[PDB]
Design a protein around this motif. Structure first.
Motif, short mmCIF file in Angstrom:
data_model
loop_
_atom_site.label_atom_id
_atom_site.label_comp_id
_atom_site.label_asym_id
_atom_site.label_seq_id
_atom_site.Cartn_x
_atom_site.Cartn_y
_atom_site.Cartn_z
N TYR A 42 0.84 -1.19 0.00
CA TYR A 42 0.00 0.00 0.00
C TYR A 42 0.87 1.24 0.00
CZ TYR A 42 -3.21 -3.62 1.53
OH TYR A 42 -3.93 -4.79 1.63
N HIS A 62 -8.45 -4.64 4.89
CA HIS A 62 -8.41 -5.86 4.10
C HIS A 62 -8.85 -7.08 4.92
CE1 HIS A 62 -6.79 -9.09 1.55
NE2 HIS A 62 -6.31 -9.56 2.68
N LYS A 65 -12.49 -7.08 5.35
CA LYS A 65 -12.97 -7.49 4.04
C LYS A 65 -12.99 -9.03 3.92
CE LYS A 65 -11.26 -5.78 -0.42
NZ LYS A 65 -10.39 -4.65 -0.87
N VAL A 69 -16.23 -11.66 4.01
CA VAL A 69 -16.43 -12.71 3.00
C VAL A 69 -16.57 -14.13 3.55
CG1 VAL A 69 -15.34 -13.94 1.08
CG2 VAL A 69 -15.44 -11.43 1.09
N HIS A 94 -7.41 -12.96 -7.39
CA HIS A 94 -6.21 -13.51 -6.76
C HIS A 94 -5.14 -13.93 -7.74
CE1 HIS A 94 -8.49 -13.69 -3.01
NE2 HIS A 94 -7.32 -13.83 -2.43
N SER A 103 -0.65 -21.52 -2.13
CA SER A 103 -0.73 -20.80 -0.86
C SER A 103 -2.08 -21.00 -0.18
CB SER A 103 -0.48 -19.32 -1.09
OG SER A 103 0.72 -19.14 -1.80
N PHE A 104 -3.05 -21.52 -0.92
CA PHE A 104 -4.36 -21.80 -0.35
C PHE A 104 -4.28 -22.65 0.90
CE2 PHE A 104 -6.32 -20.43 -4.42
CZ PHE A 104 -7.18 -19.52 -3.86
N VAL A 107 -3.25 -20.58 3.85
CA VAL A 107 -4.31 -19.72 4.36
C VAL A 107 -5.34 -20.56 5.10
CG1 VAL A 107 -6.43 -18.55 3.58
CG2 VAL A 107 -4.16 -17.67 2.90
C1 HEM Z 1 -4.17 -18.72 -1.33
C2 HEM Z 1 -3.59 -17.85 -0.51
C3 HEM Z 1 -4.08 -16.41 -0.62
C4 HEM Z 1 -3.27 -15.38 -0.76
C5 HEM Z 1 -1.73 -15.42 -0.85
C6 HEM Z 1 -4.04 -14.19 -0.85
C7 HEM Z 1 -3.52 -12.91 -1.05
C8 HEM Z 1 -4.33 -11.82 -1.27
C9 HEM Z 1 -3.88 -10.50 -1.66
C10 HEM Z 1 -2.42 -10.10 -1.89
C11 HEM Z 1 -4.95 -9.72 -1.79
C12 HEM Z 1 -4.89 -8.24 -2.19
C13 HEM Z 1 -5.58 -7.32 -1.19
C14 HEM Z 1 -5.07 -5.91 -1.39
O1 HEM Z 1 -4.48 -5.66 -2.48
O2 HEM Z 1 -5.25 -5.05 -0.48
C15 HEM Z 1 -6.12 -10.51 -1.47
C16 HEM Z 1 -7.43 -10.07 -1.48
C17 HEM Z 1 -8.53 -10.74 -1.01
N1 HEM Z 1 -8.59 -12.00 -0.41
FE1 HEM Z 1 -6.90 -13.22 -0.26
N2 HEM Z 1 -5.37 -14.58 -0.74
C18 HEM Z 1 -5.46 -15.96 -0.60
C19 HEM Z 1 -6.63 -16.74 -0.46
C20 HEM Z 1 -7.86 -16.17 -0.10
C21 HEM Z 1 -9.06 -16.87 0.31
C22 HEM Z 1 -9.14 -18.40 0.44
C23 HEM Z 1 -10.04 -15.97 0.58
C24 HEM Z 1 -11.50 -16.15 1.03
C25 HEM Z 1 -12.27 -17.22 0.75
C26 HEM Z 1 -9.52 -14.66 0.34
C27 HEM Z 1 -10.29 -13.52 0.50
C28 HEM Z 1 -9.90 -12.33 -0.07
C29 HEM Z 1 -10.77 -11.24 -0.43
C30 HEM Z 1 -12.29 -11.15 -0.24
C31 HEM Z 1 -9.85 -10.18 -1.05
C32 HEM Z 1 -10.19 -8.80 -1.62
C33 HEM Z 1 -11.16 -8.96 -2.79
C34 HEM Z 1 -11.13 -7.73 -3.65
O3 HEM Z 1 -10.35 -6.78 -3.35
O4 HEM Z 1 -11.89 -7.72 -4.65
N3 HEM Z 1 -8.19 -14.81 -0.08
N4 HEM Z 1 -5.70 -11.79 -1.16
#
Ligand code: HEM
Length: 146
Positions: A42, A62, A65, A69, A94, A103-104, A107
Motif C-alpha cells: 500500500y 483488508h 474485508k 467474506v 487472486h 498458498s491456499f 491460508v
Molecule cells: C491462497 C492464498 C491467498 C493469498 C496469498 C491471498 C492474497 C491476497 C492478496 C495479496 C490480496 C490483495 C488485497 C489488497 O491488495 O489489499 C487478497 C485479497 C482478497 N482476499 Fe486473499 N489470498 C489468498 C486466499 C484467499 C481466500 C481463500 C479468501 C476467502 C475465501 C480470500 C479472500 C480475499 C478477499 C475477499 C480479497 C479482496 C477482494 C477484492 O479486493 O476484490 N483470499 N488476497
C-alpha cells in the motif's frame, strides 16, 4: 444442515470481533509464510516485518474485508451454489495480483489455526473436519478460477 450448524455455531464466536480474529489469522499466515508479506503493498510501500502490516489501516481494512467474506460463505454453508460465481471471481482477482494456488493450503491452515485458538475445547474434531471440507469447497471454487 447437520455439518453446517457446527460451522455457524463455531463461527458466531469469531464473527463478534472480526478484526481481532482476522488479525490472528494473518499474524499466523505471515509467521508460516513470510514470503506472502510483500503481496500486500500500500502507498507503493512494502512491509518490512509482519507487525508493520498490523499498523496499516489499509491492511486492517483488508482483514475486515476477508472476514466479511468468510462470514458470507458461512451464511451460504447450506447450499454453496450461490457463492460459487463470486468465488471464481474472487479467485480471478487472486490470480491477477499474482497469488499462487499453492498458498491456499497455508491460508486454510491459518484459518483453522485461528479457529482452534479461539474455540479451544469447543473446536471439536467434527468442527475441524467440517471447516476443512468447507475451506476445501471455497478453494475449488476460487480455482475455477485460474
Ligand atoms: C491462497 C492464498 C491467498 C493469498 C496469498 C491471498 C492474497 C491476497 C492478496 C495479496 C490480496 C490483495 C488485497 C489488497 O491488495 O489489499 C487478497 C485479497 C482478497 N482476499 Fe486473499 N489470498 C489468498 C486466499 C484467499 C481466500 C481463500 C479468501 C476467502 C475465501 C480470500 C479472500 C480475499 C478477499 C475477499 C480479497 C479482496 C477482494 C477484492 O479486493 O476484490 N483470499 N488476497
Amino acid at each position: 444442515r447437520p455439518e453446517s450448524e457446527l460451522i455457524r455455531q463455531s463461527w458466531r464466536v469469531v464473527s463478534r470481533s472480526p478484526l481481532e480474529h482476522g488479525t490472528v489469522l494473518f499474524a499466523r499466515l505471515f509467521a508460516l509464510e513470510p514470503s506472502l508479506l510483500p503481496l500486500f503493498q500500500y502507498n507503493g510501500r512494502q512491509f518490512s516485518s509482519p507487525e508493520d502490516s498490523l499498523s496499516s489501516p489499509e491492511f486492517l481494512d483488508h482483514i475486515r474485508k476477508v472476514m466479511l467474506v468468510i462470514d458470507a460463505a458461512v451464511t451460504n454453508v447450506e447450499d454453496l451454489s450461490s457463492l460459487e460465481e463470486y468465488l471464481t471471481s474472487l479467485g480471478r482477482k487472486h490470480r491477477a495480483v499474482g497469488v499462487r494456488l499453492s498458498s491456499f493450503s497455508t491460508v486454510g491452515e491459518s484459518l483453522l489455526y485461528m479457529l482452534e485458538k479461539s474455540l479451544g475445547p469447543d473446536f471439536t474434531p467434527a468442527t475441524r473436519t467440517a471447516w476443512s471440507r468447507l475451506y476445501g469447497a471455497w478453494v475449488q471454487a476460487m480455482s475455477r478460477g485460474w
